[model samples]
Target: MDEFEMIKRNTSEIISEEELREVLKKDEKSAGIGFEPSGKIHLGHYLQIKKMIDLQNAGFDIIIWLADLGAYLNQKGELDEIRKIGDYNKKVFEAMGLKAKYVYGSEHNLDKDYTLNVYRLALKTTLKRARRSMELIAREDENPKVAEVIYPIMQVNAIHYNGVDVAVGGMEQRKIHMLARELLPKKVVCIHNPVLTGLDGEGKMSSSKGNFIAVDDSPEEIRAKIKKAYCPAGVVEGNPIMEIAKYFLEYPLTIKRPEKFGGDLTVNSYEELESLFKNKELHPMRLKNAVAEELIKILEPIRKRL
Candidate 1:
């Protein structure tokens, strides 16, 4: 299917119809993927990257934003080695097959020409709106600094300065991107959250919490992690196994049930899996194992390379 169709089919689960239509209404050029570079890019990064790769292949002029400076401040100078961290993160993207043009927020803005446009957009956004996004960052790593509060604005500014048509990030970033849309004159698009489950089988896969299964993780690691996941039935909020089964196990690579198993076998699209899952046709455990097996197989090459 084409990019718009693919996005239309998959993104509805995360974003509203009106929002998706609004995003689709924007010019379909100069798409972007944004990152804070606060830590190494993990498996959670993969889902969005795959979407970005799809958009890139569909002929979007891609821009990669590395918030090296933001990382430095957020980490309370632990990211003093910002340059080194940024370099490593860039290599990670390259390893994941991203060949898009990139902008390092720290390095480029020093050049007046780059910051001029950013200054223009900065004038448009208010401190209150930008500061609202801090709650997410503050919940864990609250740095109380003004810069910490203004980090979202800085990110939005990066896109505006670079003249990007769309911006992609995880659902956690939705508030900030929404702020950007309201604040900036330019258009922005938020990528869908990765469909894969966390190791804990609850909530989104977060690297800080050790619930993530990275693309760089070993097959054995993948199996062990999934085996230990929290796959309790009817726990929709943070059920990792269900998330993986529904999202990551796409067509051609499907879940084959053993005859002895009593659960309904979900196939191909996420919609089909969701139908089965909601109706209780698929047992959580069976689905978990199936997802783990397929996920490991898919990550085998990545593991070997890493």
Candidate 2:
């Protein structure tokens, strides 16, 4: 399928041409997206970048913004040492086939200034609103720190100073984006939704949770991870393995299962996979393995290149 068609099919809603054109104006005919350089680039970051690659292939210029400033602040008093970690992160993006333009917040004063503005904007937001956006991160970290209070500001500044037409993140940041919209100029677009779940099928893929499949994982590791992933029968929505099957599996254009597995092996465009997944006809274990195999195939070249 074509890029527009693929996005249209996969996306929850169609962004209107007028809206897109308006975005193109400020977007430099490109899309501005970024991630916090807290640590290694994992599958969670990889999947979102894959989505951006899809958008990039559709003729959008792409920029991978690295919030090294946020990471430095997160590390506190260790800014000099943490900057080395940012340098290491540059290679991680290179290994991932991210040839798009790259920008690190520490590289220029503009990044720091923008991030500072985000802090100011965050101050204007109610404590309830700010906390709502960051509840997940707070919960995951399990320790309330000053950074938790300041995280939203840095995020909002990322979109503003970076001149991003749209911002994307996992659903956990939905509240952040909501608060950001109120704080930022009305022109910026914020896109937040659920990401593909982790291998364990317990919660969103998180490094802290150790349920993720890293982008740098070897094929053998990928296989092993999927083999041990939690894939339950008759459960679809909450199943991480099924989520991978629907989102990451891209070949053979098939969805339904064979009669022996409980339904005819009906074949069609890849879009049918979701319908089958929603109905629970496809076994989660089989789907996880299939998704794992395909994921390995898709990432093998990138791994080698890295």
Candidate 3:
């Protein structure tokens, strides 16, 4: 595939097609993806990590934003601990095969120019818009803190101050990018990766919720988690296991089962697996087992590196 096509591989949406095309035409292009220094970097982190790798291979000067301040604002932890966690997360990202310039949000976020720009943005932005951008990002609280509102402004200013041409993040992060587009002088292409569901099949996988499979989780832990995952029979709308299979597992999966329980089967593709599961030809336990084993195999190298 061409560079543009490969870069377009797993994105859910792009901010402006014309802008991305223009970026691809340039000799020098820079794109970046940011992380909030979460407790664990799970499969949820891989989707965007994969995209950043694609961009790197496609000739974009990729940068990683370890948003330590953003995490602290979201009530993740203290700055010292958050920076340590971000450092550890960087190793995991490197193990997953990403090579790029690393940056901390606090580096320029505390700069005089950036700090002044923050207030300028804050003065221009309404409380409703800032609060809305962080609905999924910040911790849940009955009385939301002022830091929640400042968090997104920091994110917006990150792009402008750093002068990134493209901003990549999960779908939950699209709104803040949208706000950036409206506020920034230039059109910054935003790549929104699909948000995979948590094992509970309720919301996106998050650290605070502890409803995720860590990249370095033990094989036994993976099996136990998959066994208890909420994969309802014949339902794919919000099925976490199916989503995992679609994204992580390889095609042509061979399921081993007793001859009495409908023998072994070879599923050629995600679509075929989806059809089989939807029609109830595939049992949830079988699906669970297939997913658990495949995930273990895929994560083995990363775990080893960790």
TM-score winner among the candidates? 3
lDDT of 3 by residue, 1-306 (tens): 388788777678988867788888889889988898976889999878889998988788988999999888988878999999989989999999898889988876798988999998998789999999988777888998999899999999888877888999999998899999999889799998889999998788876677899999999999998899999999999999999998888888898988998999889999999999999999999999989999999989999998
Q: Candidate 2: how many backbone clashes?
A: 1
RMSD of 2: 3.9
Which lDDT tens digits does candidate 2 get at residues 1-306?
354454343443322435654554443456666666645567677766766776676677777777666665454437666667666666776777666878876675345666467657866887777667776655345566777767677777666666656666666666766676677766555544356677777777877678888777888888898888887666666777766655566655443456678754553534566566667656666566667778887777667765
TM-score of 2: 0.80
What CA root-mean-square deviation does each model show from the true structure?
Answer: 3.6, 3.9, 1.6
lDDT of each candidate versus the true structure:
0.67, 0.65, 0.89
Write out the backbone clash pairs for model 2. 30-61
Which of candidates 1 and 2 is the stronger one according to TM-score?
1
Better of 1 and 2 by lDDT: 1
| TM of each candidate vs. truth | 0.82, 0.80, 0.95
* Residue lDDT tens for model 1, 1-306: 355666544442333445445555555667777776735455677677766777677667788877777776566355557767677677677777878887786886456875575566567767676667766654354346766655666677776776766667766677777877787664455555544556775556667678888777777777788887887665555677766655556664456667786534547566677666677777776677778788887666655654
Candidate 2: list runs displaced more than 4 Å: 1-18, 24-27, 38-40, 75-77, 109-123, 139-143, 253-267, 274-285
Whole-structure CA lDDT of model 3: 0.89
> lDDT ranking from best to worst?
3, 1, 2
Each candidate's clash count? 3, 1, 0
